[PDB]
Amino acid sequence: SDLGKKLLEAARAGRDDEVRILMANGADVNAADVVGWTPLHLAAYWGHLEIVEVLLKNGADVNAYDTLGSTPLHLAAHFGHLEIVEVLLKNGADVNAKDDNGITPLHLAANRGHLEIVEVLLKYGADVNAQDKFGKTAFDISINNGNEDLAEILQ
Template sequence: MQYIRYIKKYLVFIGFLSSHLYSFAGSYEDFFKAVQFDDVRTVQSLLQRGFDPNTVNPAGMPGLMIAVREPSLKVAQLLASWPKVKTEVRNDKDESVLMLAALKGYLPLVKQLVENNADVNKTGWTPLHYAASGGHVSIVEFLLENSAYIDAESPNGSTPLMMAAMYGSPESVKVLIQAGADLNIKNQLGLTALDFAVRGNRQNAKELIETGLARLAARKAKS
């Protein structure tokens, strides 16, 4: 009899476990499908039922990263604000969610990520590099207001100003210069921000940097 009771309990446990696993599998598929299609209601419902917001897909990518990549901005905003979500996640190129949001110009999402402890000053390429490359002035200003290091150096020593000079907008170059970016820094190839502007054939950026350099020279001459 005791053996039979044991078997019954074991079967009940196996049934419960199977039901739980089946439920998780369904939720897993529903979650990533909802992320892909920016179905914020389904994602919110799953999270409220206890689904882990940091669950990764078969490629090892969490929902927040996928939402920014798609883009699924309503879902991204929800996940970025959700308690216990890991905002400081990276892809295989060492790009953070904040970097991708900054590159694409998603200011509300950038603000939410920073509020939820995303790293403004990660080592290597930074969110400010990416915001400058995209020419997104409002994001450049926001990151600087939140202690982003203006002369952060990439792995090859390039700065946000260099990225703005070659890829960004004249407005982003102007904002960085006015905020005190160093115009004379050289990267590992010996290139300055002015060199980047010339190589990128960015005449407006070139003129802004030349004006900044002239002002620096004039101040130095007076001192």
């Protein structure tokens, strides 16, 4: 897609006004690059909140997953983008989505010590006992990393 590509580039770049015009012209919100990232993936990774919102209004798949099973929520949680985490969840993001390694948004937020994001994930039903492929929980991560504050949150 000509306009799908342009949209991928614009979502990544955070070019807000360019995303708008592209939405007006029917640029494919479910365009995917070679690694399976949608515009929503891109905007989530790079922390572009307004663009996330616009894409969701225009019927972006909130639980699109990449070629390794990661979702926009995974990326927003991992890279500390609280508002985007909230927006995604409000729009039905699977709070317990596992990637191909059995890693969840909670695992990722925990690993980077993003306290507020962990609480939001928990508030929306994040499974605190979910294990990755190595049998590890967000709690295990917090302990290994020596994050006392995050350990206390995860009882």
